[PDB]
Design a binder for this molecule. Sequence first.
Ligand SMILES: C[C@@H]1ON(CCc2c[nH]cn2)C(=O)[C@H]1NC(=O)c1cccc(O)c1O
Ligand SMILES: C[C@@H]1ON(CCc2c[nH]cn2)C(=O)[C@H]1NC(=O)c1cccc(O)c1O
Ligand SMILES: [Fe+3]
Length: 284
Amino acid sequence: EPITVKHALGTTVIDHLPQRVAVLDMNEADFLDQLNVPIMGMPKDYVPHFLEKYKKDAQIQDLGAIVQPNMERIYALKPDLILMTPLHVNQYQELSKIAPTIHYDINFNNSESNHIGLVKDHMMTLGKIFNKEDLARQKVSELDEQVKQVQAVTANRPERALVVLHNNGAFSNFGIQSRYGFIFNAFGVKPASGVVDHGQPISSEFIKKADPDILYIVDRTAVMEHRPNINAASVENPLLRQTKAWKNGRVIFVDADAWYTTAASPTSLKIVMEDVKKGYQLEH
Ligand SMILES: C[C@@H]1ON(CCc2c[nH]cn2)C(=O)[C@H]1NC(=O)c1cccc(O)c1O
Ligand SMILES: C[C@@H]1ON(CCc2c[nH]cn2)C(=O)[C@H]1NC(=O)c1cccc(O)c1O
Ligand SMILES: [Fe+3]
């Protein structure tokens, strides 16, 4: 019963159970970890904390950088399956030369529609390929329950939120049509701005007209420069500090590994939803 995967970049047929798997980003690595599927190679420049055991495991080949893994190292690893994503589209043809190559059908650029369904679909596809259908279906059920939990928290709440990305002292807003669109669409968070605009840098005019009751701050610099996450005392930005969210203590410094490095896999979405719920939590 060979599986045929018709994805965004072509069609991949898998006739045998793959045994030497290369994953090209950390979302994919989280899927296979969650399915208890061994990984033969992955990039290791930005391994999230919840995949820490993989950075240290010398039996897992380091393929280099997430954004552009080392094609020479991949070819040498002789994988029998490569998992890649929209980040690697420019390498798909070259990867498919080396091994059957699956593309994760997901939209990292604009997640406003069906983000959760696309994550679930991928999980079920991987469960079929690796003969882990029952465990795949369980993880899908868990994701569904988690989504119901955050939707129960956001339901009928009046608060409106911004998702803002910190980068080297600069802050930019990510709205309903951005990479964080799914926060609004999937989980029922109400956006503090609706106007469609890298993100929109925080200006005085913007924050005046889109003054959030809740603020989720994604610290990109903590990930990229491997530095600790900023906290309330790091924030110099006066526009952010005069918002209702800041005054009322509804500022969540999110788990940047789950929100920035991944954001499209079972462990990461679980964490994202816990962070979202903290934004609504009025008491300890
Ligand atoms: C349209 C851009 O092009 N690509 C392909 C090349 C790339 C960018 N970042 C990692 N690989 C994106 O993934 C898109 N990236 C973003 O929109 C983006 C937004 C906020 C922070 C980032 O690091 C982004 O890449
Ligand atoms: C740590 C990040 O993890 N992943 C997945 C999340 C992501 C970031 N940008 C697009 N997708 C990366 O592509 C890694 N990004 C970068 O190394 C990066 C470098 C220069 C400019 C960018 O926009 C980058 O994302
Ligand atoms: Fe990027």
